[PDB]
Design a protein around this ligand. Structure first.
Ligand SMILES: *[C@@H]1O[C@H](CO)[C@@H](O[C@@H]2O[C@H](CO)[C@@H](O)[C@H](O)[C@H]2NC(C)=O)[C@H](O)[C@H]1NC(C)=O
Ligand SMILES: *[C@@H]1O[C@H](CO)[C@@H](O)[C@H](O)[C@H]1NC(C)=O
Lengths: 48, 48
């Protein structure tokens, strides 16, 4: 995993291009992907 | 002249209150801004 640098990511089959950063967002145990106003995925939970 | 001085200088005096105490004063301009921020915001939701 690479943080804070522009990368080409695949998380649980979700693919894209982003800058992976840490976050304080708190997902309920059953939630996996967060989404934005534009529905483009804002926040994911590192699976491992 | 003196009578007009008092009437003029007092007239400018009233503008301050009518501006500061009433939010609808600029309602033309505040709408011109609230149209773009409304049109762009909607243009982002279209991504959903
Ligand atoms: C014309 O009107 C003005 C006010 O609109 C008069 O000036 C006022 O006169 C009274 C005295 O009765 C004062 O108490 C006010 O302070 C005055 N106001 C101002 C702004 O000066 C003026 O006297 C009137 N002139 C005539 C000829 O009637
Ligand atoms: C994956 O393995 C690493 C060590 O190999 C371990 O630290 C991690 O907890 C594992 N993944 C998960 C989701 O626990």
């Amino acid at each position: 995993l690479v943080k804070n640098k522009c990368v080409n990511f695949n998380f649980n089959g979700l693919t894209g291009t982003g800058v992976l950063t840490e976050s304080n967002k708190k997902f309920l145990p059953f939630q996996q992907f967060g989404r934005d106003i534009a529905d483009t995925t804002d926040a994911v939970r590192d699976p491992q | 002249q003196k009578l007009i001085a008092n009437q003029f200088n007092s007239a400018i005096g009233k503008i301050q209150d009518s501006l500061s105490s009433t939010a609808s004063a600029l309602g033309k301009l505040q709408d011109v801004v609230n149209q773009n921020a409304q049109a762009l915001n909607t243009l982002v939701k279209q991504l959903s």
